Amino acid sequence: MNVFNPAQFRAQFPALQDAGVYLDSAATALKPEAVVEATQQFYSLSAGNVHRSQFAEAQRLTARYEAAREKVAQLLNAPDDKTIVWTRGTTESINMVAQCYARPRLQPGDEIIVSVAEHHANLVPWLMVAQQTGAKVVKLPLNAQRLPDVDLLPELITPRSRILALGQMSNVTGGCPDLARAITFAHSAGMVVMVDGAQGAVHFPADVQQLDIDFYAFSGHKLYGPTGIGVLYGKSELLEAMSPWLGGGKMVHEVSFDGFTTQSAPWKLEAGTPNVAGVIGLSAALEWLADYDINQAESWSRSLATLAEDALAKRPGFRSFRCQDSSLLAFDFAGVHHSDMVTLLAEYGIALRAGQHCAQPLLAELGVTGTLRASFAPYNTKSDVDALVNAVDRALELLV
Amino acid sequence: MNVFNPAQFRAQFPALQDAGVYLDSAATALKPEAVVEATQQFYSLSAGNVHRSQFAEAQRLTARYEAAREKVAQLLNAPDDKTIVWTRGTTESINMVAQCYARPRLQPGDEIIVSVAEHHANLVPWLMVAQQTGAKVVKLPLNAQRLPDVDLLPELITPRSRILALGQMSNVTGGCPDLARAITFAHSAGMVVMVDGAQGAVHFPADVQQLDIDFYAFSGHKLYGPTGIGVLYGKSELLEAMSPWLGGGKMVHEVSFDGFTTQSAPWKLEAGTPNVAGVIGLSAALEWLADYDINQAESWSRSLATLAEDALAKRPGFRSFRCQDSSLLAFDFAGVHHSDMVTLLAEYGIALRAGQHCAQPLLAELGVTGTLRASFAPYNTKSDVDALVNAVDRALELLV
Ligand SMILES: *Cc1c(COP(=O)(O)O)cnc(C)c1O
Ligand SMILES: *Cc1c(COP(=O)(O)O)cnc(C)c1O
DSSP states (O other): OOOOOOOHHHHOTTHHHHHOOHHHHHHHHOOHHHHHHHHHHHSSSOSOOOOOSSSHHHHHHHHHHHHHHHHHHHHTTOOOGEEEESSSHHHHHHHIIIIIIITTTEEEEOOEEEEEEEEEETTTTHHHHHHHHHHEEEEBBTTTTTTBGGGHHHHHOOOOOOEEEEEESHHHOOOOOOOOHHHHHHHHOOOEEEOOOOTTTHHHHTTTTTTOOEEEEESTTTTOOTOOOOEEEEEEHHHHHOOOOOOOOOOTTEEETTTTEEEEETGGOOOOOHHHHHHHHHHHHHHHTTSSSSHHHHHHHHHHHHHHHHHTTTTTEEEEOOTTTTEEEEEEETTHHHHHHHEEEEEEEEOBBOOOOOOOHHHHHHSOOOOOEEOOOTOHHHHHHHHHEEEEEEHHHOOO | OOOOHHHHTTOOTTHHHOOOOOOOOTTOOOOHHHHHHHHHHHHHHSSSOOOOHHHHHHHHHHHHHHHHHHHHHHHHHHHGGGGGGESSSSHHHHHIIIIIIITTTOTTTEEEEEEEOGGGTTTTHHHHHHHTTTTTTEEEOOOOOSSSGGGGHHHHHHTTTEEEESSSSOTTTOOOOOOOHHHHHHTTTTTEEEEEETTTTHHHHOOOOTTOOOOOEEEETTTTTOOOOOOEEOOOOHHHHHHSSSSSSEEEEEETEEEEEETTTGGGGOSSSSOHHOOOOHHHHHHHTSSSOOOHHHHHHHHHHHHHHHHHHTTTTEEEEEOOOOOOEEEEEEEEEEHHHHHHHHHTTTOBOSTTTTTHHHHHHTTTTTTTTOOTTTOOHHHHHHHHHHHHHHHHHHHO
């Protein structure tokens, strides 16, 4: 095994000097030198067919761009790179499935099962499509272990069920429900599964073949990559059966005032000029990441979180929403405003957040108006834990 | 008053040396150092609430981002910056208008007038929404001078006309239709106008107030800016009247399993994480651009295209499709393959392209299968023209 060195991984991130103690990676990730350099070069180099003094550099950029799809595929164990579609983020990917696959197939009375633990990105689009088609959203609630009650699916599925929307990993609790099982039920009922992987793709990238996943979406900026770039994975047949997304250049084959014909997947779904800087930066992020063993990287993150949780658990008033010893740590203290504490922690050099994390329904279930969340990454250290624990003590001293 | 200095202008582009004679700006523009640096800084710094050493840099990045809409507003003379919506390009902007404003309003048999000089981005979306609503697309042909025939508009407009789709400036002929008169015509008939400004914003930025434009769209990358970022301007009454675009975080106010409420515009139309680098980039590009007299800058560019056209017009077989002394020079040589010429030119260090330029109906009208295109920007020189003309000569000698 190529043993994961936390220190060498951490030293690749230029923001860390000034970032203080960065524990807000679940919201957005810091960038490695590879991503910053590739972007730098892309914007410093002509995209044209001429290079008088930097041909070598340019040929390397083109190389990253052309191999970009392949690198996402490899990450997800997708059978071939044509099942990869560029979007602007996780949000767009899901909206694409709801509009391009679902909308043209939903009839009045049809049912869309959405889990109560979903990010809005994987709920709102279904509420929309349902009011457009007359279908409706059926709720999949949490079980006793704070996870989408997948075992309840058999009861929630009727002859009218068409779609299941489930997150691989919650952005609040960090919990991962029984996805493989969920898909088995869904498929035996002729349903398609939309899987939100914005969180899962960073920590336990889904093996989309073994899991038999229909649709999978994630954002690049959480995967140590550029903003404004996302991914939609879909089985061949599904992308083929999808209708065009946005109309415009690139996505069409022939056009006239009588009508148009389109390319096939994935170009069929990619209109206009691609976010080249996004693809290249993401390709570079992935190429870099591939040097590291993610399970070892994730185990280091989770271990830090477990140390923090245990330490915080000794302070009185502590409540945790953390599932499965996750790298994410949502929590709060009784009688203290999440707003005040985030503020003080920032003053102490600690960076995290609170609020609702775009998961109003999930929070409503847990019985809270919001939570503080500290997420850990492989570039966090042991001393980061101590600093956070001490920052929290300092804050509780003033607030309680 | 100030005199435009080209030497000064072009000194800001780190790609100039390598790029040789860059004549493909109409496809995508080179970036000034300010865009590069702004991006660089953005990706090298944490977006979190803590800054221990680089606080000045972080503040200034927050300033570019907070002032972005206002700089786009200042570009178009928009009344308010709440009228500016972020997209991933001109193509997304137009798809938004078609899907969020037109689609919910169109009745069967309703008419959408589309110029034959339209880029595919401003044609396909209308073909789609027409098929989706039962409306029909009505062609607005070219006049004798290769411009959308505005005088013929009153003859094409009927009691069932609802939408006028018209490019401010063609990406082929560089021609601009009489926009102010077309709009007056359309409004007298109770029609709304979608103006594709992907070229226009670059060369003659539209005064959205003076021209009374309803919708206006353009792309960041062609405006010396980042990829994956575009703008949609719309009168505030129209944006408010639009259905939301994508569903997700940011765009929602309240969400539950019974339904949701949205933000007001522009945030209503911006779901999920925005392309923050793109915004900061485009912002920096616009701030850099505001130190130059773009009117003069455009004349300098046009002057070069005129020098180039005059010289090439002396070579037998030369045919031009240039309108109104545009800085865009589309042309071809009788009995010579464009592709071969493009190739030979590249070895002479001239960067341009051939093809259909996402404008099949226009080319079909002009009677050609494709055209070469040399577009001049303010960072080109008289030397560039000389190199172009000579490279053509050798090309002709090798291909004939
Ligand atoms: C961040 C996140 C999203 C949204 O991603 P965008 O890039 O904003 O579209 C959706 N779902 C989950 C679980 C997320 O964490
Ligand atoms: C480039 C261009 C577009 C499309 O721009 P994207 O950024 O690719 O969406 C649309 N219309 C015209 C005239 C253009 O030149």
